[PDB]
Each structure stands twice: as C-alpha cells, then as structure tokens.
Amino acid sequence: GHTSGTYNDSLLTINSDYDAYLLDFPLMGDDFMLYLARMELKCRFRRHERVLQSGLCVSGLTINGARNRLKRVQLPEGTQIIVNIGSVDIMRGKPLVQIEHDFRLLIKEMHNMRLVPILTNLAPLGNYCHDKVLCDKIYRFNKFIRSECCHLKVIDIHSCLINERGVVRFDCFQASPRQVTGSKEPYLFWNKIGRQRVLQVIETSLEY
C-alpha cells in the first residue's frame, strides 16, 4: 500500500535502560503493566509517540495490537517476554470468541518468531465489578489462557486481587478512575499495595 512500512524505526528496538522490563524480561501489555513499570520498574515513556508507551507496554494495546507490535520489533531468538494482554479487548467489548481466536494467533506468531511468551492472566477490572458480563468474560478468558498455554508458564495474578469470596479487593485499587491515551474506557489502576502484590506474584513464580 501507499503507506506501507512507514512507522517510527525507533519502535523496532527496545532497551532495558528506558523500556519496560521486569528482571531482564521485556514486558508486553497495556496501561496496567505500563503503570506497574512506571511506578515500580523505573521505565520511561517514548517521547515521540502520542499514545503513552514504554517498550512493548502500550496504552490501548489489544491482542491484535500486540500481534502487530511484535512485527515492528526485533529481538534475539529465544527471548522470553512477560505478557499481560486482553484487558483492552474486553473493555472494548470484543466478542470472547474473537478474543480467544486472536490470542491463539498471538501465541502461534510468537512461536514463529521464536519469542517465548510467559503469560500472566488478567487482573479483575476494579471499576467494572458490577458488570457481570464483563466479569464472566475475564473468568472465561483467564481459563482459556490456562488451557491454551498448557505448555507455557502461566502466572495467575487475578487471585491476589480478589478476596475469600471472589470479589475485588478495593484496598488494592486507587479511589477514582483515570483517562488513558489509547482508549476511551476509564481505568481503575492498582494502588501501591496492589502493584506490589502483582509484582511479587510474578517474581515469585519465576524465581527458580
């Protein structure tokens, strides 16, 4: 097409000095992991992009967005990437079947690129706690991650943010939702306690 291959060349290269990384693993995800990395992992935002991002963490990144983003990145074979992806698809109201279809293709594409996914499942969306349909989607998609990625490392971060009765721990979330750059839906971010719980679940799952 007329505009094919006209993107910022700087997007092809990521670097742990400035981009979102956790223990030498690149992080791929949306605003949730972007914010985790900004607050806990000293990441910097890319200065030339309108939409906030740091490495493979991009505001508004859907599963398809991630599929595209990896085509615009170049990393050594065998690179392991920690992935948290799907919240944006769910917030935008993409059909679950489509979400699962896209995720299966993301996994296959990473395999074809010789990039190894380390999966995290989805945290509860705290401001959507009254939307039973959305919460059911999170429940089913998380089960899908676990079954589809049966040969890969799958980290359950969802559990650390819900209580004994399966309802969201609001003491792990901020008080009010926020506008983000890559999506029109409001986000309720993990607070200091919430961020540390998620970070510790991920690290302790990868220690040995």
From Swiss-Prot:
Tissue: Begins to accumulate at the posterior pole of the oocyte from stage 8 onwards.
Subcellular localization(s) per the UniProt record: Endosome
Coiled-coil region(s): none
Top-level taxon: Eukaryota
Region (Leucine-zipper): 27-41
Subunit structure: Interacts with smaug (smg).
Known role: Organizes the germ plasm and directs localization of the posterior determinant nanos. Oskar protein is required to keep nanos (nos) RNA and staufen protein at the posterior pole.
Miscellaneous note of the record: Capu, spir, and stau are required for the initial localization of osk to the posterior pole.
Protein name: Maternal effect protein oskar
Organism per entry: Drosophila melanogaster
Lineage summary: Eukaryota, Metazoa, Ecdysozoa, Arthropoda, Hexapoda
Complete-protein stretch covered: 401 to 606 of 606
